[PDB]
């Protein structure tokens, strides 16, 4: 049976991890704190690696990670668990001036792009998915993220499941993934670093968490149609990530472990994603567990609602996932 | 899959036109985006200019030197693609190949990568 | 014209030989579509060498294609006689200029 009410006495849950979670988490934060003065909840945006270091560590609460455990994580610290809060999405941006169009990409497009080989934004590789728009001759400028992040982990699994044979071969998928070093290529801190390091260089491409997706526009940065196993190129937004979403709906486990990359849905967007709480089986003391069980449980029920939500472009859990995620919750004891 | 003869070559005063047919006996036409390449006499390869396949709005492209003066054509329903040369020039005297692609990077339409094939060439002379 | 080539290059039976073909970070160095070309005389061209380094079906592998910068460079090893030849580099050069070629270079066996 989950909390749905916290401890009366004073309680701090610490957070700390996903940039891409942050913004959103930064309003769930103050409002479960209006409800209820006595829990303090801090926030921080410093990536998905460190958000599961620190909570494998205990020096937080609740890890905010865009990445599900691995099993060579669960294997080193038992406890642990990912309980999924909400589903994300990862957008493609790339500073383009002259271009108004949403350019069309796919996996082995990006793929051959981080990779060195093409190297100009006029390949026909790229002008074939975008025949009758006018593409520069602007050099290809890849940016990649430089601490530990679960937008890597999202990105790396979309070029390894549409290009299995080569960046699936290496250098894989990971929160952190040992990029080719192609010429001119950068490493960035946080979705943030990314915005500002794109918006910096004219032919820079980058992967950025939906989060950020107003802040990109609003730097002038174009925002890619990336196509999916199904053949159809879409924009991540509402109605293409609930799509997405809708099929591994009842394939999620119990542990709610699960790449929802790439899905066969022909309207699916292909980088969605749970955003998870990393947090300990154990707490410090039973006020402490029940007030993180009824932050999370509220942060699934009324943080879902489409008045938070909306603001960072994420889609709710749908009903099974929340039963799910309650099931995990409830085992949070001292 | 791919067998091109080209046609319509022969004298032409300078300032005039002529137009250049190639034909595909392969079942693929449709499939690929169509060159033409030249040679003038004891000269090296110029590429002369393509058209696309419909599958990528069958749009064109031409070398600078060509541009405005020539106009590519394709009639999918006969296989057939047209070379229309205006104002020739005596410069523009070459033999003019027509060249076809392979399918490469799912794009050869868009694209022709490389001249996998080619055909034996037809020979035009700009001359008074 | 675009590209450029030695005009001619020469080896002796069984050796190797090597064409160079520079161009420049807008074509041979800005892509992967480097293309070489053998036209015997009075015949049509033959595609040997494509994507900088791969060979069409039925091309031996003496012939190799490689690039250092943006200069792509085309290797004959165990020359034959048939090998005489004319050889023509060719790469993409963006959405403007789209296809060059090098000038050529003309193949000569020394025995």
């Known amino acids: 049976t989950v909390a749905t009410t916290p401890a009366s006495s004073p309680v701090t849950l610490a957070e700390t991890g996903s940039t891409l979670l942050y913004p959103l988490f930064n309003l769930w934060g103050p409002a479960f704190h209006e409800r209820y003065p006595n829990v303090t909840i801090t926030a921080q945006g410093t990536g998905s690696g460190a958000g599961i270091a620190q909570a494998a560590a205990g020096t937080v609460n609740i890890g905010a990670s865009d990445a599900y455990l691995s099993e060579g994580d669960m294997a080193a610290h038992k406890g642990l668990m990912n309980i999924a809060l909400a589903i994300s999405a990862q957008q493609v941006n790339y500073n383009l001036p002259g271009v108004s169009e949403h350019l069309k990409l796919n996996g082995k497009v990006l793929a051959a792009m981080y990779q060195g080989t093409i190297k100009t934004w006029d390949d026909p590789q790229i002008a074939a998915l975008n025949p009758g728009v006018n593409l520069p001759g602007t050099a290809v400028v890849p940016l990649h993220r430089s601490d530990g992040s679960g937008d890597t982990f999202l990105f790396t699994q979309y070029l390894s499941k549409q290009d299995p044979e080569g960046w699936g071969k290496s250098p894989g998928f990971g929160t952190t993934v040992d990029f080719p070093a192609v010429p001119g290529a950068l490493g960035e801190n946080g979705n943030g670093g990314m915005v500002t390091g794109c918006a910096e260089t004219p032919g820079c491409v980058a992967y950025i968490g939906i989060s950020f997706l107003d802040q990109a526009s609003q730097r002038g940065l174009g925002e890619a149609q990336l196509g999916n196993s199904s053949g159809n190129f879409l924009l991540p937004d509402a109605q293409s990530i609930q799509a997405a979403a809708a099929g591994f709906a009842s394939k999620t486990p119990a542990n709610q472990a699960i790449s929802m990359i790439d899905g066969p849905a022909p309207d699916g967007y292909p980088i969605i994603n749970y955003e998870y709480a990393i947090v300990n089986n154990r707490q410090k003391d039973a006020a402490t567990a029940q007030t993180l069980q009824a932050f999370l449980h509220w942060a699934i029920t009324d943080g879902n609602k489409a008045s938070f939500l909306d603001q960072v472009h994420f889609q709710p859990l749908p009903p099974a996932v929340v039963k799910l995620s309650d099931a995990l919750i409830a085992t949070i004891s001292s | 899959e791919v067998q091109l003869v080209e046609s319509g070559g022969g004298l032409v005063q300078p300032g005039r036109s002529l137009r250049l047919s190639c034909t595909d006996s392969g079942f693929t036409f449709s499939e690929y985006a169509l060159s033409w390449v030249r040679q003038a006499p004891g000269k090296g390869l110029e590429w002369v200019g393509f058209?696309?396949?419909?599958?990528?709005?069958?749009?064109?492209e031409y070398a600078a030197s060509v541009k405005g003066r020539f106009t590519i054509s394709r009639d999918d329903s006969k296989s057939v693609a047209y070379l229309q040369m205006n104002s020739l020039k005596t410069e523009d005297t070459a033999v003019y190949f027509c060249?076809?692609?392979?399918?490469?990077?799912?794009?050869?339409?868009?694209?022709?990568?490389?001249?996998?094939?080619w055909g034996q060439g037809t020979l035009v002379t700009v001359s008074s | 014209s675009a590209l450029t080539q030695p005009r001619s290059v020469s080896g002796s039976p069984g050796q190797s030989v090597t064409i160079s073909c520079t161009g420049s970070?807008?074509?041979?160095?800005?892509?992967?579509?480097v293309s070489w070309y053998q036209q015997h005389p009075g015949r049509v061209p033959k595609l040997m060498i494509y994507d900088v380094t791969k060979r069409p079906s039925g091309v031996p592998d003496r012939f190799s294609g490689s690039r250092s910068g943006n200069t792509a460079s085309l290797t004959i090893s165990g020359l034959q006689a048939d090998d005489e030849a004319d050889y023509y580099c060719?790469?993409?050069?963006?959405?403007?200029?789209?296809?060059?070629f090098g000038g050529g270079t003309t193949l000569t066996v020394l025995g």
């Open positions: 060719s790469s993409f050069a963006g959405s403007s200029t789209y296809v060059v």
């Open positions: 060249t076809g692609p392979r399918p490469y990077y799912d794009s050869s339409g868009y694209y022709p990568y490389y001249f996998d094939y």
């Open positions: 058209i696309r396949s419909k599958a990528y709005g069958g749009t064109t």
């Open positions: 970070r807008s074509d041979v160095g800005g892509y992967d579509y």
